[model samples]
Target: YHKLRLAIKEICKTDGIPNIKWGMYIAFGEKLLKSYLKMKAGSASSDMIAEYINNAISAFSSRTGISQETAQKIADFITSNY
Candidate 1:
């Protein structure tokens, strides 16, 4: 149906934060944990957390010109196995 297609399209174009790929989330977390040791020996810093998010935004914007959905996915990939 046309409506359904439009809905899907809209979602693709405007889904959750872009450049925040799920895969990268894991990999980057690992790297950061290794580097900083997670503050209290079990968790990351709020400021570092904010850096991750902000970095994601800039990363997405730089590569995809977007920052809400598709861009997030791109972010995920680079920070992932790469």
Candidate 2:
């Protein structure tokens, strides 16, 4: 499985995304944004996607809290920029 994954990655690196769909881009951007926010939050825990996303939203927005609006904006910006 790991070798197959690496081969797929190499294919994408050389040929770019095959389907020409935005999902891959969005997913990549999400991962990048997740990294950024986790760094800022100073609490990186890769075991929990739900906790990561929830905390990341607050961290990225400089909020003393979290909300749907902030999360949506962060997601939108990440999607747009990358």
Candidate 3:
């Protein structure tokens, strides 16, 4: 239930991700959060774990044509939950 639709959408606005792809990005964002949250819950936030999440940010930004700064915001949201 920890949705990042709002978080994703907020950056999408500033970064100009097409409205048509909101669901696509949001859906993928959930995957990143889901994976990270599970890992975080089970273990400490290690360098590799943080790298994995950052990779998600890069992946998301690259695929969706968003800014890394924008992507970083959403990713920061994920890490901050720790």
lDDT against the true structure, per candidate, is 0.44, 0.46, 0.72
Best-to-worst order by TM-score is: 3, 1, 2
Q: Over the stretch 1-82, how does candidate 2's per-residue lDDT look in tens digits?
A: 2332343344444444444432343443456465656555775454564455556555644633323453444454543543
lDDT string for model 3 (1-82, tens) is: 3456777788778778778876766776778788887887888559878789777877777864555676677677767853
**Could you tell which candidate, 1 or 3, scores higher by TM-score?**
3
Error of 2 at 4 (Å): 29
Off by over 4 Å in 3: none
Better of 2 and 3 by TM-score: 3
Looking at model 3, the pairs that clash are: none
Residue 19 accuracy (lDDT) in model 1: 38
- Candidate 2 positional error at 26, Å: 0.6
Query: Taking the tens digit of each residue's C-alpha lDDT, what string does model 1 give over 6-62?
Result: 333444445553434433433433443344334435576768655765665565457
Candidate 3 clash total?
A: 0
Candidate 1 residues lying further than 4 Å off, grouped into runs, are 1-41, 68-82
